[PDB]
Scaffold this active site. Structure first.
Site, short mmCIF file in Angstrom:
data_model
loop_
_atom_site.label_atom_id
_atom_site.label_comp_id
_atom_site.label_asym_id
_atom_site.label_seq_id
_atom_site.Cartn_x
_atom_site.Cartn_y
_atom_site.Cartn_z
N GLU A 52 0.77 -1.23 0.00
CA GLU A 52 0.00 0.00 0.00
C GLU A 52 0.82 1.30 0.00
O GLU A 52 1.84 1.42 0.70
CB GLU A 52 -0.95 -0.01 1.19
N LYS A 127 -10.19 2.42 -2.36
CA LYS A 127 -10.46 1.99 -0.99
C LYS A 127 -11.88 2.37 -0.61
O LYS A 127 -12.23 3.55 -0.57
CB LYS A 127 -9.47 2.66 -0.05
N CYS A 158 -6.25 -2.16 2.89
CA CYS A 158 -6.08 -1.96 4.32
C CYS A 158 -7.32 -2.19 5.16
O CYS A 158 -7.66 -3.31 5.46
CB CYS A 158 -5.52 -0.55 4.60
#
Lengths: 271, 271
Positions: A52, A127, A158
């Protein structure tokens, strides 16, 4: 036991890079250097993952500044770089998140760009689930399940691994793995990282790969590290430490099948 | 941090009994003996759990024979026994599964009977997800979320913990805990038991209690044991070994809250 959800045994490589320095060029260059090593150590690799926000600093007040890349038909400095690495080697490259800026809406996202073996930008994932941490970036709205000549695989980012919906979704669509470029920290990591990875794999009986940045104690954010690959039954087949390194695994279609036979995915949908 | 999903701090007791012998009376009697010890060691207990199929042998060819119990208005030998233990002590008693026989359909199920503090049979859960293992028993169709003067809690049975839907369901309805009378074995237990328990608790941020029978190496089935109680963040707060024993915990509303603040459940339901 041979081509259904996964066409063949494909070897993969997670690159726990210690990039994210203020110098973008140096970051990409390093991501290039390390993918060359991945391909040299394991030539039959077919899928490579980066961690990431690898091309820039992992900080909300810098995102705007480094979102410099936008993704369309016509490349971008980061979109081009990864695109060229994509086809130079066989590999399908999951660019593992970079700050994104939308020209129209002027919003900046955290997106993972996925390329194919010829270098074409297949799909991308903004995301979904994500105070400043939400006061600088905007959320995504699509579930990402990339199609590949070997099968399909999901991609989340994440905080996205904390929501099983993203996995169930990509998994039941036929995915043989859920890949998550993520960066937990020295506090949150020890608590949930291993659990979630192994939890999303056994619940959906798919492979799960988590690619974290190398723990850099010289930055504001102290990444947990421990990029891992766990198999359909919960077993961790590959795992990094905290430092910078490359781990390797092999996704076997017989493993997925063997364990799907064992614990059936036939749920009483009446609920 | 005080009465929302859980009104007050309630102490609980899981009874990892080594019952299931051919003599039903002796099994009940033993379940009685051990619940007396639970209340003696911890008088402020409010919730007590027994393990799966505790009143009879854990074998498909015996269920029919021992399903002797039916649950209605007019009690049954086992429904009466647990009912009397229910109100003798303050406790809400999750009778943790017994072979059930439906007088009408003539079908036999594996149901967990729940009682309240006065001894009334509040609700019951027929194992939903479940060769003989499915050629002797019939499946249930309801999701069980019992209402209680302290809050609501879900109940599932053994194989049911392998389908997150059941947990998400009861949890989002307001449950502060998902209780599962289960009996894994020395093979399946080391692999998925701890993971599932902790996975269902961190994903739904509720308490999870698993009540296993005591490992009896003298029977066809070798229960894994390890009855546990994990908190909203994945921490195991109570855990038994393989032998016969009673473990204790305290469900705190501040723990659930404190960790719900930390990791919000606010999901982008747009998926």
């Amino acid at each position: 036991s041979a081509s259904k959800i996964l066409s063949q045994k494909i070897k993969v490589a997670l690159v726990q890079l210690s990039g994210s320095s203020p110098d973008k060029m140096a970051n990409l260059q390093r991501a290039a250097t390390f993918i060359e090593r991945a391909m040299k150590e394991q030539p039959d690799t077919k899928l490579v993952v980066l961690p990431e926000c690898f091309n820039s600093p992992y900080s909300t007040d810098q995102f705007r500044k480094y979102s410099e890349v936008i993704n369309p038909k016509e490349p971008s400095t980061s979109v081009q770089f990864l695109s060229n690495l994509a086809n130079k080697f066989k590999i399908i490259l999951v660019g593992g998140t970079i700050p994104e800026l939308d020209p129209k809406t002027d919003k900046i996202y955290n997106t993972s760009i996925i390329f194919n073996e010829d270098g074409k930008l297949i799909d991308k994932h903004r995301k979904v689930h994500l105070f400043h941490e939400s006061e600088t970036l905007s959320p995504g709205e699509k579930s990402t399940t990339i199609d590949t000549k070997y099968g399909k695989f999901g991609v989340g980012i994440c905080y996205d691994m904390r929501f099983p919906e993203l996995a169930m979704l990509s998994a039941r669509k036929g995915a043989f793995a859920m890949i998550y470029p993520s960066a937990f920290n020295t506090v949150t990591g020890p608590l949930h990282w291993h659990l979630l990875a192994r939890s999303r794999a056994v619940d959906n009986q798919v492979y799960v790969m988590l690619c974290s940045p190398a723990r850099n104690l010289q930055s504001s954010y102290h990444a947990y590290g421990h990029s891992i690959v766990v198999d359909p039954r919960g077993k961790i087949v590959a795992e990094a430490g905290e430092g910078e390194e490359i781990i390797y695994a092999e996704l076997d279609p017989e493993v997925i099948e063997s364990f799907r036979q064992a614990v059936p995915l036939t749920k009483q949908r009446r609920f």
